[PDB]
Design a protein around this ligand. Structure first.
Ligand SMILES: O=c1ccn([C@@H]2O[C@H](CO[P@](=O)(S)OP(=O)(O)OP(=O)(O)O)[C@@H](O)[C@H]2O)c(=O)[nH]1
Length: 670
RNA sequence: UGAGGUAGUAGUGCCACUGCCUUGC
């Protein structure tokens, strides 16, 4: 390069800081809004304290950039409740407006805005790594005047190039500041040292994971090793001879190093040691950019980038900006929710979702269809006898190898809703034990096909019985499911309408082929939970919450005397078909699974963030942490919701070889 | 002795496989 053009570029690099960049008055205004927020939270959050973090304290962003504030709540306080009460305080307070919930984001945040300052603000909890890295960045910038303009210019280039937005597939701006400081560290005649010195005793490349950086104290970087060895490293080496090149030289060197000298798809841009760390050493993908935060040695901050076309776009932008300084003419390959595909912007995607008046004759037809389906699919006495007989035969055969073994029936067949053409599930009581059970099952001649699974959520052995022609699965010492199905059996016994509606829902799910657990779709347990939730959420209470009328297994179990403990007894007067149509309408519309969880444990609605399941969700009433949709993909969720809306459409519209076949038709519903 | 994410494989959306794993009541 040339010094004259370097100074010319530095003029603009400083101007971009002066205009559309943080300046002392802007920092003072940010401090003032922080004091105002402290005043707002004075009475409600005296124990807790507020911290200024992010671009607001880094001075590496822009005036438009949001105001990031952190809630350093004490140990007793928890992030969910603290953030929720913060949002409530923001809502009630008149200073701020348009207070909303942004909990869906990757980082738990609350969005706010002041009608006076007119600046977007975001309140977070925890996230001490971001605060630490921002503090380090601002300390280095204050120590080195060249760093701040360079990082500001990188941020502005990212914003103009559309890579700033994480949703659009671009990498976070903080990672760009980390890239800039990494370049400052690596380049020849480095201005700054690394905080992990190879000269320190007991240091090796394979030990990099053990080493970590805690925080900067007294302008000295503190790092710990996991006896414990700690070595203090000064931020600036005691060197009086350093390059005097303007900031434009640093910017051009950054562009040269990143565009040409460095292979973004070969090594990791992480500031841990001087030695160039190979990708295979720390076991990271070589496809896309990989970076590790200095204070987080087990996090890939570049996970936002997941599209090779985006990588090519970024590389082309780097090359063209380097050529210009030695940004336009193309559109970004925006990544979105739908299978990481371009499609339509992440905001709206095809996968994301959202008649004549009802007549007595159509309602009667619907009730007739529901009751007919129940009666036809109701397990016959002979069918129940056959089921218990095959279970008894299996138990007797097993007793030969495992004396004193108890084999219990659970689910639809016993202590639950009956059904036909439904797989049989049983529980065993007394990874090697499941293997022995599978082996002894293989020894049997009756059952021929056995498919054991020990890596599933629950160990299981499933096989097909020829004599009864039934798919029988056995779980190992699983007693939670017994109580789970007993609760629903009691619910059904309370009112016949519950049983009718659950039978109808099971028929619909089985006909629509969305009730196969092994394929990843929600099991019939989830659909029973959903129908029970609708039962409890009806404007009149059809069934009171038996619960709250190594987890809680206590709930009301007295069918006869429910009215005494249930003030609103017999309040609902709707028909079975009316209940089914209402459930379909409620789930298709007027309900959202993103901000709510399908839980029948308590009457009060439970928000998703309380369970921390940011990304349909169904909560097992007995196992709060367990989620039925954890192993469910987005595609299957959208298929299930499409099936539900199709069922709502077919059932809602009145119409004037059998009535059963007209409804629950797999072709019509799919 | 199966559905989804992650590196790779010769012919050329060309596609089926193969190394590991959360998920396969
Ligand atoms: O995540 C879970 C937790 C529990 N269960 C357990 O599944 C049971 C309900 O089982 P179903 O969903 S009517 O399956 P079916 O084929 O209709 O009858 P089956 O029971 O397999 O003989 C019920 O006891 C519940 O506790 C799951 O299937 N998935």
């Amino acid at each position: 390069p040339t010094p004259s053009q370097i100074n010319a570029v530095g003029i603009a690099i400083d101007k971009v800081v002066q205009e559309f960049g943080l300046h002392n008055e802007n920092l003072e205004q940010r401090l003032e809004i922080k004091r105002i927020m402290e005043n707002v939270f004075q009475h409600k959050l005296p124990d807790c304290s507020l911290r200024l973090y992010g671009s607001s304290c880094s001075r590496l962003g822009f005036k438009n950039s949001d105001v990031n504030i952190d809630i350093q709540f004490p140990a007793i306080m928890s992030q969910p409740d603290v953030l929720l009460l913060v949002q409530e305080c923001l809502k009630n307070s008149d200073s701020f407006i348009d207070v909303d919930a942004d909990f869906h984001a990757r980082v738990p945040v609350v969005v706010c805005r002041e009608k006076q300052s007119g600046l977007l603000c975001k309140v977070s909890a925890g996230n001490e790594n971001a605060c630490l890295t921002t503090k380090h960045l601002t300390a280095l910038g204050k120590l080195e005047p060249k760093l701040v303009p360079l990082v500001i210019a990188f941020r502005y280039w990212a914003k103009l190039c559309s890579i700033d937005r994480p949703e659009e597939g671009g990498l976070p701006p903080y990672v760009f500041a980390l890239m800039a400081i990494f370049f400052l560290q690596q380049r020849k005649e480095p201005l700054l040292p690394v905080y992990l010195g190879s000269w320190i005793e007991g240091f090796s490349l394979s030990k990099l994971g053990n080493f970590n950086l805690q925080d900067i104290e007294k302008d000295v970087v503190i790092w710990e090793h996991t006896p414990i060895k700690r070595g203090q490293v000064s931020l600036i080496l005691d060197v009086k001879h350093q390059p005097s090149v303007p900031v434009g030289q640093l910017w051009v060197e950054l562009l040269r190093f990143y565009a040409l000298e460095f292979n973004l798809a070969d090594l990791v841009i992480s500031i841990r040691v001087k030695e160039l760390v190979s990708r295979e050493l720390k076991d990271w993908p070589k496809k896309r950019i990989a970076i590790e935060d200095p204070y987080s040695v087990k996090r890939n901050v570049a996970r936002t980038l997941n599209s090779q076309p985006v990588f090519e776009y970024i590389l082309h932008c780097l090359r063209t900006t380097y050529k210009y300084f030695a940004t336009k003419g193309k559109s970004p390959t925006v990544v979105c929710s739908l299978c990481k595909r371009e499609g339509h912007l992440k905001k709206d995607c095809p996968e994301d979702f959202k008649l004549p008046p009802l007549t007595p004759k159509f309602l009667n037809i619907l009730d007739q269809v529901c009751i007919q389906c129940y009666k036809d699919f109701s397990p016959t006495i002979i069918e129940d006898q056959a089921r218990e007989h095959i279970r008894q035969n299996l138990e007797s055969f097993i007793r030969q190898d495992f004396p004193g073994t108890k084999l219990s029936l659970f689910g639809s067949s016993k202590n639950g809703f009956g059904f036909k053409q439904s797989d049989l599930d049983v529980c065993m009581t007394i990874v090697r034990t499941i293997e022995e059970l599978a082996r002894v099952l293989r020894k049997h001649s009756g059952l021929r096909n056995i498919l054991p699974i020990t890596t599933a959520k629950v160990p299981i052995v499933k096989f097909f019985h020829l004599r009864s022609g039934l798919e029988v699965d056995i779980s190992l010492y699983n007693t939670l499911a017994l109580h789970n199905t007993r609760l629903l059996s009691a619910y059904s016994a309370i009112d016949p309408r519950v049983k009718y509606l659950c039978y109808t829902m099971k028929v619909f799910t089985k006909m629509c082929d969305i009730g196969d657990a092994s394929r990843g779709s929600l099991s019939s347990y989830a659909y029973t939970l959903m129908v029970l939730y609708f039962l409890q959420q009806r404007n009149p209470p059809v069934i009171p919450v038996l619960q709250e009328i190594g987890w809680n297994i206590y709930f009301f179990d007295q069918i006869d005397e429910l009215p005494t403990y249930w003030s609103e007894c017999g309040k609902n007067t709707e028909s079975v078909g009316q209940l089914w149509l209402g459930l379909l309408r409620f789930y298709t519309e007027e309900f959202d699974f993103k901000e709510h969880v399908i839980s029948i444990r308590r009457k009060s609605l439970l928000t998703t963030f309380k369970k921390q399941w940011t990304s349909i969700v169904i909560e097992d009433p007995f196992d709060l942490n367990h989620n039925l949709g954890a192993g469910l993909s987005r595609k299957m969720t959208n298929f299930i919701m499409k099936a539900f809306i199709n069922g709502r459409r077919v059932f809602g519209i009145p119409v004037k070889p059998s009535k059963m076949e007209y409804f629950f038709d797999p072709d019509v519903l799919t």
